[PDB]
Structure formats: structure tokens, C-alpha cells
Amino acid sequence: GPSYHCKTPDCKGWCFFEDDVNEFTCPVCFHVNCLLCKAIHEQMNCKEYQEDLALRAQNDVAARQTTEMLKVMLQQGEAMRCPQCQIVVQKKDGCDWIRCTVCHTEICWVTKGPRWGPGGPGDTSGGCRCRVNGIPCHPSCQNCH
Ligand SMILES: [Zn+2]
Ligand SMILES: [Zn+2]
Ligand SMILES: [Zn+2]
Ligand SMILES: [Zn+2]
Ligand SMILES: [Zn+2]
């Protein structure tokens, strides 16, 4: 069970990652962190945050740093786009499964795509079909729900 450090400057707030929890309310500074954007964006959904962050690339050097950082993460695994709404999702250490914050699509992190077909939970006509006939979606999978 790995951990996340609050993004408020110099804050000592931290949490463990949990499969079903995508937001961290810091007990120190009380700010709400988003555990898939790794950022505090309390008047935005994740899509509004990520688009505005790309608009600050022209030009903030800090934003341009992180936006180009993310584009290497996506091009090399350790980050991915939601297969449904296409927001950039970053890893939650120890969690093989994530429910998108914007569209609520279940994402299989092990296989870097959807958990299920359209029609959602139970539809093994798409997605990673973990455990059908006993086979895990990947032999490293431990629990993608
Ligand atoms: Zn904090
Ligand atoms: Zn977010
Ligand atoms: Zn989504
Ligand atoms: Zn899976
Ligand atoms: Zn699996």
C-alpha cells in the first residue's frame, strides 16, 4: 500500500492510495487533492484542469515543464488516457484498477485500457476480461476488480 504527498507547498499531508478513493482531503491544510491528476483543482473537473494546464503552456515554464513531462509518461507507460473520456490518468501505486473521475469508466491499469466493454461492469465482450476461464488479464495482475 503506497502513499501520496499533498501538493500544498511544503505541506506534510500524506495518504495511502485506495482503490475506491480518488480524492485526498488533506488533514493539515484541508485542501482536496485529486489522486489521478496529482493536483489540487477544487473549482474544476479533471478535464477543465488539464486543458487549462495546457493553455498555460504558452507560456509558463512550470506548466510547460509538467505538460511535456506528462507527454513522456503517456508515450512510455506509467500514465494513460481514459479510454472513454480521454483525460490523462496517472498511476496510483498499488492499485490495478481505477474508476475515472470524469466519466466513471472502470480502467484496468495493468493492461492500460478499459476493464469492461461498453455496457460496463459484467460486459466481458470488451476490455481486459480478467479471470475469464481463470486467466488473469496479465500474470502480474493482483486485483483489477
Ligand atoms: Zn495539505
Ligand atoms: Zn483531477
Ligand atoms: Zn474518463
Ligand atoms: Zn485487468
Ligand atoms: Zn486483472
Residue numbers in the entry: 366 to 510
Which text from the study accompanies this structure?
LUBAC is a heterotrimeric ligase which consists of the three proteins HOIP, HOIL-1 (also known as RBCK1) and SHARPIN. Two of the LUBAC components display Ub ligase activity, HOIP and HOIL-1, and both belong to the family of RBR (Ring-between-RING) ligases. HOIL-1 is a member of the RBR E3 ligase family with the ability to ubiquitylate its targets by linking a hydroxy group of the substrate to the C-terminus of Ub. We show that HOIL-1 activity requires linear tetra-Ub binding which enables HOIL-1 to mono-ubiquitylate linear Ub chains and polysaccharides.
To elucidate the structural features which enable HOIL-1 to exert its unique catalytic activity we solved the crystal structure of fragment 366–510, which comprises the IBR and the RING2 domain. The overall structure shows that both domains are linked by two helices, which are positioned at a 50 angle. This arrangement brings the IBR and the RING2 domains into close vicinity to each other and allows them to form an interface which buries a total of 1,303 A2 of solvent accessible surface area. K457 of RING2 is a central contact point for the IBR domain, and is coordinated by F382, E383, V386, and N387. The C-terminal histidine (H510) of RING2 forms a polar interaction with D385 of the IBR domain. These interactions, together with further hydrophobic and polar contributions by D458, K456, Q455, I452, V467, and R464 in RING2 with N387, K403, and L401 of the IBR, create a surface which largely obstructs the catalytic cysteine C460. We therefore assume that the observed structural arrangement represents a catalytic inactive conformation of HOIL-1 in which the catalytic cysteine of RING2 is masked by the IBR domain. As expected from our sequence analysis, the C-terminal part of the RING2 domain of HOIL-1L reveals a unique architecture not observed in other RBR ligases so far: The C-terminal 36 residues form a loop structure which is laced up by a binuclear Zn cluster coordinated by six cysteines. This structure adopts a compact conformation which packs against the second beta sheet of the canonical RING2 fold. HOIL-1 displays a tryptophan (W462) instead of a histidine located two amino acids downstream of the catalytic cysteine, questioning if HOIL-1 requires a histidine to assist catalysis as observed for other RBR ligases. The C-terminal residue of HOIL-1 is a histidine (H510) which forms a pi-staking interaction with W462.
